[PDB]
Amino acid sequence: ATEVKVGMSGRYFPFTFVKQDELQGFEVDVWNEIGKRNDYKVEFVTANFSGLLGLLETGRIDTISNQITITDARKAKYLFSDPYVIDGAQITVRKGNEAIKGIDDLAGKTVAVNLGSNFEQLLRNHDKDGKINIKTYDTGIEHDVALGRADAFVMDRLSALELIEKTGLPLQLAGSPFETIENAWPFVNNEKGQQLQGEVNKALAAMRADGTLSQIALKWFGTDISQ
Ligand SMILES: [Cl-]
Ligand SMILES: [Cl-]
Ligand SMILES: [K+]
Numbered sequence: 001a002t003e004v005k006v007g008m009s010g011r012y013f014p015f016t017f018v019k020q021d022e023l024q025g026f027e028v029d030v031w032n033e034i035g036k037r038n039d040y041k042v043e044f045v046t047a048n049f050s051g052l053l054g055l056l057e058t059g060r061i062d063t064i065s066n067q068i069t070i071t072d073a074r075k076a077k078y079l080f081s082d083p084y085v086i087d088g089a090q091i092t093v094r095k096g097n098e099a100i101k102g103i104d105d106l107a108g109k110t111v112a113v114n115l116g117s118n119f120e121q122l123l124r125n126h127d128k129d130g131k132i133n134i135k136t137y138d139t140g141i142e143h144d145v146a147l148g149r150a151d152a153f154v155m156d157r158l159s160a161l162e163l164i165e166k167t168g169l170p171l172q173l174a175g176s177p178f179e180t181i182e183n184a185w186p187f188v189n190n191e192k193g194q195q196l197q198g199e200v201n202k203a204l205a206a207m208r209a210d211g212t213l214s215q216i217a218l219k220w221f222g223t224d225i226s227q
Contacts, residue, residue, distance in 0.1 A: 003041045006031050007061040010046040011139055014162055014220040015067055026220040027065035033212055037203045048138040050115040056186060062196060067156060069118040069181040079187040081200050085225055088177025089119055090157035094145055095170040100152055102175035107131035112141045112153040119154040122179055146170050156181060158225055
């Protein structure tokens with residue numbers, strides 16, 4: 001059997017998170033089904049998001065299942081599979097705050113972003129004159145905004161929506177998503193990476209056909225986020 005290592009953070013509800021001392025979520029269920037279909041011994045390695053892409057290049061993991069958005073720079077540095085989730089980058093503020101209607105309102109504000117994430121680069125590209133006070137983190141991002149240490153943060157709409165409705169955090173969506181994001185699994189451009197890529201695309205396409213991918217998405221979001 002082929003050993004495959006899947007990097008994640010364990011702090012990305014409901015994609016990858018811990019509850020009752022169990023590492024679970026959307027990314028966990030998906031790669032267990034992939035491992036059934038390709039004779040993989042899947043091994044989950046939890047690490048902060050800022051170092052997941054580093055672990056991938058060094059070779060201590062084989063891929064990452066953590067909503068890795070495909071970017072122009074990441075295309076040149078890694079291989080990617082077919083996108084399995086499509087969404088948009090969302091600004092989210094504290095509940096009751098109407099002083100921030102979108103990304104153009106961040107001038108002079110403090111916006112939290114995960115370090116090394118596509119949301120940081122997008123935010124720095126949307127900061128032409130240094131108006132925004134970008135604060136980068138790996139944990140406690142949505143908590144600083146709900147408490148007041150940061151004015152807003154930028155993630156995907158899906159995860160923020162579940163924190164607002166399911167979890168119940170005192171947060172609200174700030175406007176409409178300003179950038180579509182296509183999320184796929186990155187691979188190292190080597191023999192095993194090319195081998196995993198082609199075999200994962202065949203499993204991903206096979207899961208979309210029989211509805212298994214939709215079953216996983218409905219369990220973790222109530223909505224088929226694969227569509
Ligand atoms: Cl990312
Ligand atoms: Cl900096
Ligand atoms: K991302």
